[PDB]
Amino acid sequence: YTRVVWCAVGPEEQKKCQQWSQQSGQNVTCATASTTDDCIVLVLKGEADALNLDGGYIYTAGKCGLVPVLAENRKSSKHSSLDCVLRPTEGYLAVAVVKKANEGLTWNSLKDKKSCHTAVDRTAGWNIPMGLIVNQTGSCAFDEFFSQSCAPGADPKSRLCALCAGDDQGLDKCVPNSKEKYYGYTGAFRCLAEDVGDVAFVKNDTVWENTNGESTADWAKNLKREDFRLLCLDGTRKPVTEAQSCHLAVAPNHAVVSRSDRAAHVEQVLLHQQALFGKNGKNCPDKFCLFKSETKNLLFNDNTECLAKLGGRPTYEEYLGTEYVTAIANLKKCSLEACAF
Ligand SMILES: *[C@@H]1O[C@H](CO)[C@@H](O[C@@H]2O[C@H](CO)[C@@H](O)[C@H](O)[C@H]2NC(C)=O)[C@H](O)[C@H]1NC(C)=O
Ligand SMILES: *[C@@H]1O[C@H](CO)[C@@H](O[C@@H]2O[C@H](CO)[C@@H](O)[C@H](O)[C@H]2NC(C)=O)[C@H](O)[C@H]1NC(C)=O
Ligand SMILES: *[C@@H]1O[C@H](CO)[C@@H](O)[C@H](O)[C@H]1NC(C)=O
Ligand SMILES: NC(=O)c1cccnc1
Ligand SMILES: [Fe+3]
Ligand SMILES: [Zn+2]
Ligand SMILES: [Zn+2]
């Protein structure tokens, strides 16, 4: 049944997809939508086959019967012989970052400050930090905790979208796709780097990849690691070198999902496609690389080493872990079980 339709979210992923489609001789084609939720609906309709999702969206996707297929895998020193494709995944660290110069700003003096989020419903940018905040404050009124935010996905007219910028021209303010200047892990850290916000909720890989000459992008050009700090839950402030001990939680890797009746087929074309355009593919650097997009994390995060088999053909709760499934459940009570479409 060898022909896979990828769902791209927004015009930039649409363009990267169209490119990949060409280089594959149409073994993969593209469908496009404005939001991740819409791409999820397309897959359900059967109009698209798969897409890579942050854990927060896997949860939405799972209640509707979509299943995790292969997971993103970057690389950790001690997990060495084992192949990337068979190596277990580690999950990433969700952290809260602040400007060093913002002396005296801790996890406990966050109320009324200005925040930068990857996008509503996402693990590091939303579910983990707001989960703790509802928790800590005993209030479901998370829309009144920060004076202002850029939380792609919220009501364009609420304070939660006040700090968002939209595209080149001011259009699409607060859309949960890359047209929004402060969308995703990158847009969010940018929102803080330009001091639009006091804190950004991203993952720890983001600070390292957009500081000390790693980014090339004009806004990240002069960023230095020592000018940032991580906020720990114990009210303390640490250098970004100490994330192992100052994170809010460890998140499950983004993963490709698809309808169960389509999973095997999706899995097979991907392992092949990967063999050709992944980290060491026949054709990567020279013609095309699935995992690169010059600091934008288009379709896939730019630090993905390979997509890996899951082992224990896990359901989505098994993939997310009970720990995280319950964090999302408790937070979702504020805004009991069904495909939400
Ligand atoms: C926010 O507070 C809630 C309430 O204690 C935390 O909740 C529960 O999480 C623990 C540990 O994972 C579970 O054993 C309980 O079953 C959960 N309680 C309920 C009523 O569901 C919640 O996880 C905290 N937020 C974070 C980010 O950890
Ligand atoms: C925090 O995020 C950064 C960037 O994504 C990670 O940085 C690298 O660590 C890997 C191995 O862990 C090395 O191969 C790279 O050299 C590091 N990057 C840079 C630019 O120095 C880092 O692993 C993460 N740290 C934690 C605690 O999660
Ligand atoms: C497309 O898929 C077919 C079927 O597996 C494969 O034989 C062929 O090499 C692929 N072509 C390209 C250009 O990827
Ligand atoms: N998703 C799972 O079932 C699982 C099992 C063991 C380790 N990691 C993930
Ligand atoms: Fe994420
Ligand atoms: Zn931990
Ligand atoms: Zn299982």
Curated annotation (Swiss-Prot):
Post-translational modification: Poly-N-acetyllactosaminic carbohydrate moiety seems to be needed for TLR4 activation.
Annotated Fe(3+) 2 binding sites: 54, 92, 185, 254
GO annotation terms (biological process): antibacterial humoral response; antifungal humoral response; bone morphogenesis; innate immune response in mucosa; iron ion transport; negative regulation of apoptotic process; negative regulation of lipopolysaccharide-mediated signaling pathway; negative regulation of osteoclast development
Keywords: Antibiotic, Antimicrobial, Disulfide bond, Glycoprotein, Hydrolase, Immunity, Ion transport, Iron, Iron transport, Metal-binding, Osteogenesis, Protease, Repeat, Secreted, Serine protease, Signal, Transport
Family the entry assigns: Belongs to the transferrin family.
Residue numbers binding hydrogencarbonate 2: 118, 122, 124-125
Any one GO molecular-function label of the UniProt entry: signaling receptor binding
Disulphide bridges: 7-39, 17-30, 64-339, 84-306, 116-191, 140-334, 150-164, 161-174, 232-246, 284-289
Shown residues in whole-protein numbering: 361 to 705 of 708
Domain Transferrin-like: 4-333
Native species: Bos taurus (Bovine)
Gene: LTF
Oligomeric form and interacting partners: Monomer. Found in a complex with LTF, CLU, EPPIN and SEMG1. Found in a complex with MPO and LTF; interacts directly with CP, allows Fe(3+) incorporation into LTF and activation of CP ferroxidase activity.
Name of the protein described by the UniProt record: Lactotransferrin
Positions bearing carbohydrate: 27, 135, 204
GO CC, any one term: specific granule
Domain of life, per lineage: Eukaryota
Role according to the record: Transferrins are iron binding transport proteins which can bind two Fe(3+) ions in association with the binding of an anion, usually bicarbonate. Lactoferricin binds to the bacterial surface and is crucial for the bactericidal functions. Has some antiviral activity against papillomavirus infection. N-terminal region shows strong antifungal activity against C.albicans. Contains two BBXB heparin-binding consensus sequences that appear to form the predominate functional GAG-binding site.
Compartments where located: Secreted; Cytoplasmic granule
